């Protein structure tokens, strides 16, 4: 059974925030467990469509690419995540899951029937509008979550050839680049104490992915305010070698951690940096897979994000 029937895609999301402190850096295991169960269908859907996308990308397997599209079509037709959203954890999940669905569609779209195109693209544009509208409230502070919202908007923009979505995504990307301080920090992520390095990593990942998707349109977003992203990315790689700087600047000893999943933006960025060897140690921690970024980052950095039809 190489393409199982798609799982139910509920219009509703009810996630549960799980941090115990004001800096959102210490995890409540009971709330984390509660949230894991509540968003299991969202995480599993993303994992599956990205796995199907990765299999399509190997070639000689159009059926896997077609499986991703049937799954996306099912969630499109049930209005998944377009219904009701201790914090805005449900919105964060809609942002991340939109990103995963939109990346999967971007990678497999050549195989789509016209029926799947109408279904999926209407749904991706409604998710883009809903997720963008979340950020209309100035009380929603534009940290890495805002950059992650750009992933789904950008993938939707490229796949639907929508110039206005493309401009919306470019605004989000440039806002992230413009927030990098002269020393490379992002103050909203530096406020996360023992998770400061973690969230400089997690903020870099969607900015890099958006710049890489921009190449699919023949644009080089890496030239925008050139040098700023390099400072941020270099801080992340230096931080994994030696957290001393993040310890000093954040006021807290960093949580022991190795690069994983979304840290795979380094598979793309090491091909762009003026000092690529700085990313050797992160590269050596791979390969990297993240459904929220479209699947296997190590392979996509080598083969291109979108397989050739």
């Amino acid at each position: 059974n190489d393409c199982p029937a798609p799982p139910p895609g509920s219009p509703d999301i009810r996630a549960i925030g799980y941090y115990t402190d004001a800096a959102r850096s210490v995890i409540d295991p009971r709330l984390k467990t509660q949230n894991d169960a509540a968003v299991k269908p969202l995480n599993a859907f993303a994992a599956h469509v990205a796995k199907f996308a990765d299999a399509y990308a190997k070639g000689a397997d159009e059926a896997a690419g077609r499986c991703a599209l049937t799954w996306l079509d099912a969630w499109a037709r049930s209005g998944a995540m377009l219904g009701r959203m201790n914090n805005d954890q449900s919105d964060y999940m809609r942002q991340w899951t939109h990103g995963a669905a939109a990346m999967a569609y971007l990678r497999t779209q050549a195989l789509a029937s016209e029926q799947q195109r109408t279904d999926i693209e209407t749904w991706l544009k409604r998710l883009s509008a809903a997720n963008l509208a979340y950020w209309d409230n100035p009380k929603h502070k534009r940290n890495n979550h805002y950059y992650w919202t750009g992933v789904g908007i950008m993938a939707t923009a490229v796949a639907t050839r929508d110039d206005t979505l493309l401009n919306t995504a470019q605004g989000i990307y440039r806002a992230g680049i413009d927030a990098i301080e002269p020393d490379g920090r992002l103050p909203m992520e530096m406020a996360r104490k023992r998770l400061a390095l973690h969230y400089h990593d997690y903020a870099t990942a969607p900015l890099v992915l958006m710049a890489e998707m921009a190449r699919l349109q023949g644009e080089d977003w890496y030239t925008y305010r050139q040098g700023a992203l390099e400072r941020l990315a270099a801080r992340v790689a230096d931080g994994y070698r030696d957290p001393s700087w993040f310890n000093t600047q954040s006021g807290a000893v960093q949580e022991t951690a190795t690069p994983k999943a979304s840290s795979g933006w380094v598979e793309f960025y090491r091909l762009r940096s003026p000092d690529p060897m700085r990313f050797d140690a992160m590269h050596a921690a791979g390969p990297f897979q993240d459904p929220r970024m479209g699947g296997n980052l190590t392979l996509m950095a080598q083969e291109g994000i979108v397989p050739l039809p």
Side-chain angles (χ1 to χ4, degrees), residues 186-226:
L186 285 164
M188 296 198 63
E189 324 298 343
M190 197 57 90
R192 307 293 293 274
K193 300 201 168 313
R194 71 185 65 181
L195 295 183
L197 163 67
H198 176 75
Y199 276 114
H200 280 75
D201 190 357
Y202 210 56
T204 300
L207 300 170
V208 169
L209 191 67
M210 281 194 281
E212 293 290 335
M213 278 183 282
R215 297 285 189 97
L216 308 174
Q217 303 288 258
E219 290 174 356
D220 194 358
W221 290 8
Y222 282 117
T223 65
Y224 177 75
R225 280 295 253 180
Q226 196 171 0

Side-chain angles (χ1 to χ4, degrees), residues 48-57 59-83 85-268:
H48 275 93
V49 298
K51 164 176 82 148
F52 299 151
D54 286 337
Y56 172 50
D61 194 355
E62 298 200 316
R66 291 185 191 271
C67 196
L69 291 158
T70 206
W71 277 47
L72 298 163
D73 188 83
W75 276 34
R77 286 282 275 279
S78 63
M81 316 190 282
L82 283 171
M85 305 287 104
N86 55 36
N87 77 320
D88 309 329
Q89 204 66 30
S90 296
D91 284 299
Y92 305 153
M93 281 303 309
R94 183 162 72 177
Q95 294 158 7
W96 287 319
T97 306
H98 178 215
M103 289 305 303
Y105 183 64
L106 175 60
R107 296 187 73 195
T108 62
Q109 78 172 140
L111 299 174
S113 78
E114 305 312 302
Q115 168 81 250
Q116 291 166 333
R117 286 180 206 277
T118 47
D119 292 342
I120 297 169
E121 294 187 11
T122 299
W123 174 63
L124 293 180
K125 296 199 179 186
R126 284 201 236 181
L127 289 164
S128 299
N131 280 334
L132 182 63
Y134 172 83
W135 298 108
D136 285 329
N137 191 332
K139 290 189 197 164
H140 295 154
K141 302 309 169 171
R142 290 174 177 196
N143 68 344
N144 69 84
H145 287 298
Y146 182 60
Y147 317 151
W148 273 101
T149 298
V151 174
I153 300 178
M154 179 63 174
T156 304
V158 171
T160 68
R161 299 172 158 212
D162 186 329
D163 280 358
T164 71
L165 285 184
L166 178 68
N167 284 343
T168 292
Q170 189 183 231
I172 295 177
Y173 169 83
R174 288 181 177 194
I177 298 312
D178 288 346
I180 303 169
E181 296 185 13
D183 67 4
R185 81 176 64 198
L186 285 164
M188 296 198 63
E189 324 298 343
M190 197 57 90
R192 307 293 293 274
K193 300 201 168 313
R194 71 185 65 181
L195 295 183
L197 163 67
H198 176 75
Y199 276 114
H200 280 75
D201 190 357
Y202 210 56
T204 300
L207 300 170
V208 169
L209 191 67
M210 281 194 281
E212 293 290 335
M213 278 183 282
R215 297 285 189 97
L216 308 174
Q217 303 288 258
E219 290 174 356
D220 194 358
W221 290 8
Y222 282 117
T223 65
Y224 177 75
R225 280 295 253 180
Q226 196 171 0
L229 180 58
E230 170 65 11
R231 287 175 192 153
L232 168 61
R235 288 302 188 188
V236 174
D238 288 339
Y240 278 114
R241 158 181 58 84
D242 174 12
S244 160
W245 184 83
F246 281 109
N247 292 349
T248 299
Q249 308 304 334
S250 77
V253 172
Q254 297 307 285
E255 202 179 68
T256 306
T258 73
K260 71 182 73 213
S262 60
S263 301
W265 54 267
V266 63
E267 306 292 65
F268 295 104

Side-chain angles (χ1 to χ4, degrees), residues 11-29:
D12 308 313
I13 301 177
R14 193 157 61 216
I16 298 86
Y18 51 83
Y19 285 114
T20 56
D21 57 335
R24 297 118 42 225
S25 66
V26 176
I27 298 195
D28 180 350

Side-chain angles (χ1 to χ4, degrees), residues 36-48:
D36 286 347
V39 306
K40 186 75 167 301
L42 298 169
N43 282 338
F45 179 85
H48 275 93

